[PDB]
């Protein structure tokens, strides 16, 4: 289901995400699941040669957010929003990492 999205890489470790992004540029990103904890997800984002990792938090009402001020019903809505408005991320989610 989520696999249809360019930016959704499934289970990938933090350190592996950094390798996947190392061919990236500012705004290169991917969304990953924890290999150990099903349902636990993060966004990994490249900026100025480094990778910033943001846990996708779940609100008491089930909404998702990476930045408390901006909350969403679905992950696709969250990513679409943050692709144009950084809103707490170091930069926008602009360039989905090629899946490998």
């Amino acid at each position: 289901s989520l696999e249809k999205h360019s930016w959704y890489h499934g289970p990938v470790s933090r350190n592996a995400a950094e390798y996947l992004l190392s061919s990236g540029i500012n705004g290169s990103f991917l969304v990953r699941e924890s290999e150990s904890s099903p349902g636990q997800r993060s966004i990994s984002l490249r900026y100025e040669g480094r990778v910033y990792h943001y846990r996708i938090n779940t609100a008491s009402d089930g909404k998702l957010y990476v930045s408390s001020e901006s909350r969403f019903n679905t992950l696709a809505e969250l990513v679409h929003h943050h692709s144009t408005v950084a809103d707490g991320l170091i930069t926008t989610l602009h360039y989905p990492a090629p899946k490998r």
């Binding site: 360019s6 390798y19 692709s83 144009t84 360039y95």
Partner: protein
């Protein structure tokens, strides 16, 4: 598999050290490109450079003979996420 932008990327001429690569110019517009290249697997790192939006080719030179490279072309500012796209990437052995 995800579709890419640009849509085509090819090594059109090569020596063991020096490549000419080509992708498809946009039907509409682009501001400029960023290209990254480096040894496949990421151990030795990646270099990044810009390409003017008037081009749809680039040269990459000073590569090591017989080595595998990952080359990725980004249309800078293109809304990849809106259209569910990734940057185009190839692997090439020199």
């Amino acid at each position: 598999s995800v579709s890419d932008v640009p849509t085509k990327l090819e090594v059109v001429a090569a020596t063991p050290t020096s490549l000419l690569i080509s992708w498809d110019a946009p039907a509409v517009t682009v501001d400029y490109y960023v290209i990254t290249y480096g040894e496949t697997g990421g151990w030795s790192g990646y270099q990044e450079f810009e390409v003017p939006g008037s081009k749809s080719t680039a040269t990459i030179s000073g590569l090591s003979p017989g080595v595998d490279y990952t080359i990725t072309v980004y249309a800078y500012g293109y809304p990849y996420v809106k259209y569910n796209k990734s940057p185009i990437s190839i692997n090439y052995r020199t």
